């Protein structure tokens, strides 16, 4: 809904901006087991490609039911009576056709390549000159590094843009953490 707040640019001595500021965004939630609530929104307003950086500050709009129904147990409280809430913010009536996504990138792993190609419980008599893999050569990774266990710097991802709507998430339809489209504007 409307009830979204931003804090101003204060330095925080609890969160290093080194290796986990674009990895742990919804990882401490229980959205990977999906036993209770399932509504969570993932956004990225900041597309700035100058030199070795893409995205560095937090503005990620989640759902409406998660702050109100899922928080019957103490999980984000304690910081209730710190400050007084000021003049409320509006939901922006403009929005562009800009928003980025990451849904479906799992097609052909690179740590395990040579044996995914033909195993159907049979032999290999011709397995040396089947296709030329020496023709193509590409080197670019401008995407969000999002890490896991037993990883190097980053495994892979390629920009597979084009699916975009002005429609947010829906109930029951989740693939990783986000559906086709969404609402976040520039201001």
């Amino acid at each position: 809904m409307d009830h979204y707040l931003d804090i101003r640019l204060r330095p925080d001595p609890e969160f290093p901006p080194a290796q986990l500021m674009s990895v742990l965004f919804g990882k401490l939630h229980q959205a990977l087991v999906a036993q209770g609530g399932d509504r969570i929104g993932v956004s990225f307003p900041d597309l700035d490609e100058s030199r070795s950086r893409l995205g560095e500050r937090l503005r990620i709009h989640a759902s409406a039911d998660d702050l109100r129904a899922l928080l019957a147990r103490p999980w984000l409280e304690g910081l209730r009576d710190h400050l007084q809430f000021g003049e409320p913010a509006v939901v922006p009536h403009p929005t562009p056709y800009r928003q980025v996504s990451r849904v479906q990138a799992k097609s052909n792993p690179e740590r395990l390549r040579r044996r995914l190609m033909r195993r159907h419980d049979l032999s290999e008599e011709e397995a040396r000159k089947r296709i030329p893999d020496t023709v193509a050569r590409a080197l670019d990774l401008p995407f969000v590094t999002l890490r896991s266990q037993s990883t190097g710097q980053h495994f892979r991802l390629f920009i597979r843009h084009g699916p975009l709507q002005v429609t947010a998430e829906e109930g029951g339809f989740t693939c990783y953490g986000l559906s086709k489209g969404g609402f976040v504007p520039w201001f």
Partner: peptide, 14 residues
Amino acid sequence: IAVEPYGSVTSQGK
């Protein structure tokens, strides 16, 4: 903050 002479934070940067 941790009690340090010239009290610094080594990875957050400040």
